[PDB]
Swiss-Prot record:
The chain holds residues 107 to 447 of 447 of the full protein. Its main location: Golgi. This is Alpha-1,3-mannosyl-glycoprotein 2-beta-N-acetylglucosaminyltransferase. Initiates complex N-linked carbohydrate formation. Essential for the conversion of high-mannose to hybrid and complex N-glycans. Keywords: Cytoplasm, Disulfide bond, Glycosyltransferase, Golgi apparatus, Manganese, Membrane, Metal-binding, Signal-anchor, Transferase, Transmembrane, Transmembrane helix. The lineage of its organism: Eukaryota, Metazoa, Chordata, Craniata, Vertebrata. Substrate binds at R14, D41, H87, D109. The gene is MGAT1. It comes from Oryctolagus cuniculus (Rabbit).
Amino acid sequence: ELAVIPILVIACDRSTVRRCLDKLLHYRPSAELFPIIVSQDCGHEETAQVIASYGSAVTHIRQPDLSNIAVQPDHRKFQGYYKIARHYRWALGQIFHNFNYPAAVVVEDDLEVAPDFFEYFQATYPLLKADPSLWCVSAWNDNGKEQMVDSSKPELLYRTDFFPGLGWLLLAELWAELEPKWPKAFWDDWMRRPEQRKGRACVRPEISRTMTFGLKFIKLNQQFVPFTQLDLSYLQQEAYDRDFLARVYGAPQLQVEKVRTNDRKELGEVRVQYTGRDSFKAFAKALGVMDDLKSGVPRAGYRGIVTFLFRGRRVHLAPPQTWDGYDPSWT
């Protein structure tokens, strides 16, 4: 069954929200199934005029409080981040309380969507509703540069412990949990903390369904995949944690230097094992994978495993299988 899922576009003072809206409107399959609500903060007149010119194709709402926010002593340079957090709190409150929608896909104004962006969320929304171990579906692959993704598998999806944002679906139920403790600033890194995440994962793709414009190297998928016609049961936690983990640890192990230099090419899928924070950093860097960690979680990591393509080979940068939780001190 098809479900109504609003798209909440977060805008402020960039006239290029035009490019974001033009792509969303071009690919939208139904205005009824995907109403677009553009929440504009900042009161930038030119941007307001641009949004208004779309007329009824979107609903334009305006964050009401344009005042400066009192910041804490360590944050004089970060007024903008306090304003962003205030805008998200207000806009999500509008989509879930005033409009009373059951879920929403949050899209920053500098994101261009892929042709199957809507199909992807329509197909994954039922997974999010049914699996309490998931808390979001994201269009973003943090290691999604062209040379690091398999273009022959545009349909492949994964679970990740690293909340990616950048085009993401959440349920009204999650907003009910987050709203009472919403932070003053740095909302996305706050969601990445264990006190918020509570061990929950997001679905993310092999090839990103959003790309930033105006991170710049992430490749936007251009081959339409009919996700609603595919069997996505493999993403259920019980199946995924058995099958994907058996796949990762069943793969032959190779030293990082051998992967880097393309040795043993007959092995199309391998595992590079790291044992501590220093080796994770070093190995990630050697293979061109993002090496920063938020609350101890690596970008696109799942049970500590970062999966990507390297010189055409599938690689799993993984901890020993005795892994049992993230350590926030891995900074």
